[PDB]
Amino acid sequence: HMDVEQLGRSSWTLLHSVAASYPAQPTDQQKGEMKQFLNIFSHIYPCNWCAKDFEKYIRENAPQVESREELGRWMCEAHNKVNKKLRKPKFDCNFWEKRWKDGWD
Amino acid sequence: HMDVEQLGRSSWTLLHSVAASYPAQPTDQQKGEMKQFLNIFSHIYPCNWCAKDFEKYIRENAPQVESREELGRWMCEAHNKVNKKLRKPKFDCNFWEKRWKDGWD
Ligand SMILES: Cc1cc2nc3c(=O)[nH]c(=O)nc-3n(C[C@H](O)[C@H](O)[C@H](O)COP(=O)(O)OP(=O)(O)OC[C@H]3O[C@@H](n4cnc5c(N)ncnc54)[C@H](O)[C@@H]3O)c2cc1C
Ligand SMILES: Cc1cc2nc3c(=O)[nH]c(=O)nc-3n(C[C@H](O)[C@H](O)[C@H](O)COP(=O)(O)OP(=O)(O)OC[C@H]3O[C@@H](n4cnc5c(N)ncnc54)[C@H](O)[C@@H]3O)c2cc1C
Asked: Can you list the disulfide-bonded cysteine pairs (chains A, B)?
């Protein structure tokens, strides 16, 4: 059984929350585990076509893990690629921090 | 900002969904990435006390990744440890597959 909407909202909540909690100056270790986290996520995400695309996205636009600001923007753009594919409106990445780090809306 | 309830429900949805999609006979690779996924998750989960505990849980009761049936039960019991800590009722792990693999309730 696949409930792709609830799984999708839940999973974006988790991804954007992890990027909002990420350091502005990450350790070399924090950078490496974030890259691996994201790669593995793309292998095991339980919505099979969802997974492969996001996995090609990670290969063609590698996660930017040098800081919170870069990672958050990266996530916002990864999510917007999926929004475009689904004919949903674009999210203003200028407001990624207001939404996910400060928690407004 | 930390909204631990929505983040928590979202994150359990993702974890139980990944275990429901896991093979009954996983490849050696699938086993290794699941272990690493879970370890990294426990490092980066954005609710700091939540994270450390679950990380000690993974060290004291290592993820059982040999099959879907074992992994799903493991996840159910990991979640029940947190339910106990929060004075929520215990979930019947006998019904883990009905809930998360078949999608009823
Ligand atoms: C990696 C991944 C790939 C997916 N691929 C597919 C797919 O191929 N086909 C499919 O049908 N579904 C896919 N899904 C599901 C889809 O993305 C949506 O989650 C689902 O349709 C639910 O949509 P929603 O309108 O409730 O909000 P969601 O798109 O899940 O958004 C949740 C909330 O995030 C905020 N938000 C929206 N856009 C952004 C952004 N760019 N940056 C930051 N915050 C934002 C908004 O506040 C929004 O309400 C995928 C999910 C994930 C995690
Ligand atoms: C790893 C982790 C650690 C956390 N630690 C804390 C913490 O220390 N303190 C804190 O306040 N919050 C913590 N949270 C949040 C907490 O677990 C809940 O998610 C949150 O309180 C929301 O509760 P809920 O009643 O909406 O349902 P949740 O507990 O999130 O459950 C979601 C749904 O899962 C199903 N379910 C319930 N139990 C099980 C089970 N054993 N197996 C399978 N399915 C089940 C039910 O259908 C339930 O509605 C943590 C979350 C995670 C992911």
From this structure: 47-50, 76-93
